[PDB]
């Protein structure tokens, strides 16, 4: 994709902190950038759209290469168009913004400078942040996570990609998404079909695969921490159903792990721990600490979770499912959890902990998003039963308090139009350097 010249692209400033062993922390001057899929895409020769709503202009885009040559991503009005506002160390994302047009959700990335994403290697470190999910009802997902996207957005070896990280280009994740308009420096017009339900999306012939660390996927009802492995941890391109993942006809046939090794306190049998008025009270802001412990050789072997709220340091809840003990993500837990729930261990199949270790060494980009789910209505995160026809007596089926008919986008984009999430006070450093409490 080309650089559009009709609207200035200004990345909203966002501060975050780096801490060292002593507990002392310094402030970084970061910036946020909107993912390329949300942007206006128009001709390099004027204002004619290359894409509108769910449909490509086939004169401007008769093939994937020519499209990339002809089409430019332009600047975004973060607050007015997308409901994205950054102030100090705080990033707020609104679910629905009714400006001149209707916008639903957003996906943003943390930048080091105006043409490079910030990268993280969190091995033997912790990533910590505050969040307010009180405005997130059933069906919403405020996600804060990491993927090994190229720091420059792909420009160094993609001749038709000039827009790069400056315009939020380069997304990949563990579902090998095919809804991306631009993948590895080519458009995705070939094979494109508009979505059956979503006015503003579709799927193309190719998908964008990489490893994915879902540090945080949550609403006011439930939360999940889920690493996902991949054969090759950085971006690879796939075609059609061989991609695997959500919109494939054969979910587990690809080169990535679409399910991950998840820890949702509710799914692990504790319904009293996280939610409204619970031990982690989603009525109020709380701190989320995620620690990445290593073996003697520097490979990842455990992800621990702590919360801080109202001054109290709260350990992660123990899994109470018979055969699945502990409160952290380890190889023992992942093995046990997949065996006991009867889920396919694609986490292990694509390299597991060694894969995530490789992902961190390659460098992870921080992603902060808010979305609804046209595929499964976020029932995997918050439903009384997923699948909706499964027996709630069977361990692993129940994930939250939401009904099996909750979270339908056409419903919630109206009924939850005021929904939002606020991520704030990001801190990174050695284990136990980023937080304190009783
Ligand atoms: C991107 O996906 C498109 C669509 O599937 C692929 O285009 C096909 O390419 C094959 C091989 O050249 C042709 O036989 C077909 O005619 C194309 N199909 C369509 C619908 O145009 C393209 O190969 C993919 N890109 C990559 C890098 O795999
Ligand atoms: C597609 O782009 C061409 C070239 O700019 C333009 O003339 C035409 O009106 C566009 N077609 C549609 C259907 O938008
Ligand atoms: C860090 O803090 C946790 C929570 O209090 C504690 O369990 C652990 O022993 C500490 N580890 C280190 C390396 O300081």
Enter the DSSP assignment of 115.
Answer: T
Tell how far CA 311 is from the center of its chain.
28
Strands 420-430 and 13-19 come out as: parallel
- CATH says 2-438 is which class? mainly beta
Angle, to 10 degrees, between the axis of helix 352-362 and the axis of helix 331-341? 130
Quick count: other Cβ atoms within 10 Å of Cβ 69? 16
Q: Where are the beta strands (DSSP E) in 1-87?
A: 2-3, 13-19, 25-34, 41-43, 51-52, 55-56, 71-73, 84-87
Is there an atom of ligand 2 within 6 Å of 190 CB? Answer: no
CA–CA separation, 213 and 66 (whole Å): 34
User: Which of 68, 206, 241 is the best mutation target for the ligand 1 pocket, counting ligand atoms within 8 Å of the beta carbon and taking the most?
Assistant: 206
CA–CA separation, 307 and 234 (whole Å): 30
User: Which among 388, 395, 398 is positioned nearest to 336, based on CA atoms?
Assistant: 395
CA angle 178, 379, 360 (to 5 degrees): 55
CA–CA separation, 83 and 60 (whole Å): 30
The residue whose CA is least distant from atom 12 of ligand 2 is 57
Our answer to whether residue 79 is catalytic in this structure is no
Q: Provide the resolution (angstroms).
A: 2.1
CA–CA separation, 96 and 191 (whole Å): 29
Residue 362 in 3-state DSSP? Answer: helix
Residue tagged active-site, from 9, 126, 212, 413: 212
* Token reading at 40: 């206006």
For tokens 């801080």, what's the residue? 308
CA–CA separation, 211 and 360 (whole Å): 10
Q: Which helix (H) or strand (E) holds 14?
A: strand 13-19
Q: Where are the beta strands (DSSP E) in 148-230?
A: 182-183, 186-187, 193-194, 202-203, 206-209, 212-218, 223-228
User: Which among 260, 261, 266 is positioned nearest to 220, based on CA atoms?
Assistant: 266
For tokens 């061989």, what's the residue? 242
* CA 402 to centroid of ligand 3, rounded, Å: 35
Query: Which whole-number Å values give the CA distances from 15 to 29, 308, 430, in the listed order?
Result: 5, 20, 19
CA angle 20, 153, 360 (to 5 degrees): 40
Q: Tell me if 274 sits within 8 A of 268, measured CB to CB.
A: no
The residue whose CA is least distant from atom 3 of ligand 3 is 432
* CA 57 to centroid of ligand 2, rounded, Å: 6
CA–CA separation, 87 and 275 (whole Å): 27
User: Which among 388, 387, 381 is positioned nearest to 262, based on CA atoms?
Assistant: 381
User: Which among 332, 297, 327 is positioned nearest to 315, based on CA atoms?
Assistant: 327
Per DSSP, what are the bridge partners of residue 238? 207
Report the C-alpha dihedral over residues 388, 393, 398, 404, rounded to 10 degrees: 30
Our answer to whether residue 212 is catalytic in this structure is yes
Can you spell out the DSSP letters for 338-358? HHHHT---HHHHTTHHHHHHH
Report the C-alpha dihedral over residues 392, 393, 397, 401, rounded to 10 degrees: 50
For tokens 């508009």, what's the residue? 194
206 is in an annotated binding site: yes
Q: How was this structure determined?
A: X-ray
Quick count: other Cβ atoms within 10 Å of Cβ 88? 11
CA–CA separation, 400 and 409 (whole Å): 18
Burial class, 418, CB count within 10 angstroms (exposed 0-12 / middle 13-18 / buried 19+): exposed
Query: Which whole-number Å values give the CA distances from 267 to 314, 366, 429, in the listed order?
Result: 19, 26, 30
CA–CA separation, 245 and 258 (whole Å): 5
Strands 119-120 and 13-19 come out as: unpaired
* CA 325 to centroid of ligand 3, rounded, Å: 20
What is the C-alpha end-to-end distance of the chain, expressed in Å? 51
Over its C-alpha atoms, the chain yields an Rg (Å, rounded) of: 21
* CA 43 to centroid of ligand 2, rounded, Å: 10
Enter the DSSP assignment of 38.
Answer: G
Q: Is the peptide bond before 387 cis (omega within 30 degrees of 0)?
A: yes
Q: Tell me if 356 sits within 8 A of 300, measured CB to CB.
A: yes
Question: Which ligand has the minimum distance to the alpha carbon of residue 304?
Answer: 3
For tokens 């919360």, what's the residue? 307
Residue 128 in 3-state DSSP? Answer: strand
User: Which of 291, 432, 435 is the best mutation target for the ligand 3 pocket, counting ligand atoms within 8 Å of the beta carbon and taking the most?
Assistant: 432
CA–CA separation, 167 and 355 (whole Å): 28
Is there an atom of ligand 3 within 6 Å of 432 CB? Answer: yes
User: Which among 155, 290, 283, 104 is positioned nearest to 214, based on CA atoms?
Assistant: 290
CA–CA separation, 416 and 226 (whole Å): 26
Q: Tell me if 319 sits within 8 A of 329, measured CB to CB.
A: no
> Please, which residues have CB within 8 angstroms of residue 416's CB and are 6 or more apart in sequence?
95, 96, 137, 139, 140
For tokens 């995530």, what's the residue? 356
């Amino acid at each position: 994709q080309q650089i559009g010249t009709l609207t200035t692209e200004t990345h909203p400033p966002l501060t975050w902190q780096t801490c060292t062993s002593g507990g002392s922390c310094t402030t970084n001057n970061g910036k946020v950038v909107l993912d390329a899929n949300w942007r206006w895409l128009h001709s390099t020769s004027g204002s004619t759209n290359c894409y509108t709503g769910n449909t490509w202009n086939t004169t401007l885009c008769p093939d994937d290469t020519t499209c990339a040559q002809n089409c430019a991503l332009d600047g975004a009005d973060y607050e007015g168009t997308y409901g994205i506002t950054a102030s100090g160390n705080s990033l707020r994302l609104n679910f629905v913004t009714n400006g001149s047009q209707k916008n639903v959700g957003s996906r943003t990335y943390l930048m080091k400078d105006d043409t490079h994403y910030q990268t993280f290697n969190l091995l033997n470190q912790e990533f910590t942040f505050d969040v307010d999910v009180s405005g997130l009802p059933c069906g919403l997902n405020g996600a804060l996570y990491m993927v090994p996207m190229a720091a420059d957005g792909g420009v160094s070896n993609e001749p038709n990609n000039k827009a790069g990280a400056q315009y939020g280009v380069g997304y990949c994740d563990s579902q090998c998404p095919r809804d991306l308009k631009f993948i590895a420096g080519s458009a995705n017009v070939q094979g494109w079909e508009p979505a059956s339900n979503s006015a503003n999306s579709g799927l193309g012939g190719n998908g964008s695969c990489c490893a994915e660390l879902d540090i945080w996927e949550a609403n006011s009802i439930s939360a999940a921490l889920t690493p996902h492995s991949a054969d090759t941890v950085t971006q690879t391109v796939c075609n059609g159903d061989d991609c695997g993942g959500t919109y494939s006809n054969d979910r587990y046939s690809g080169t990535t792990d679409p399910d991950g090794c998840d820890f949702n306190s509710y799914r692990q049998g504790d319904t009293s721990f996280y939610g409204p008025g619970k031990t982690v009270d989603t009525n109020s802001k709380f701190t989320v600490v995620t620690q990445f412990l290593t073996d003697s050789s520097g490979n990842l072997n455990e992800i621990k979770r702590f919360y801080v709220q109202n001054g109290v340091v709260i350990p992660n809840s123990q899994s109470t499912i018979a055969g699945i003990s502990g409160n952290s993500i380890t190889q023992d837990y992942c093995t046990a959890q997949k065996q006991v729930f009867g889920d396919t261990n694609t986490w292990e199949d694509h390299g597991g902990f060694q894969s995530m270790t490789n992902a961190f060494k390659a460098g992870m980009v921080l992603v902060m998003s808010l979305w609804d789910d046209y595929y499964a209505d976020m029932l995997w995160l918050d439903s009384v039963a997923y699948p909706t026809d499964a027996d709630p007596s069977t361990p692993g089926v129940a994930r939250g308090t939401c009904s099996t008919t909750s979270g339908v986008p056409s419903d919630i984009e109206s009924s939850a139009a005021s929904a939002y999430v606020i991520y704030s006070n990001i801190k990174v450093g050695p284990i136990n350097s980023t937080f304190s409490g009783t």
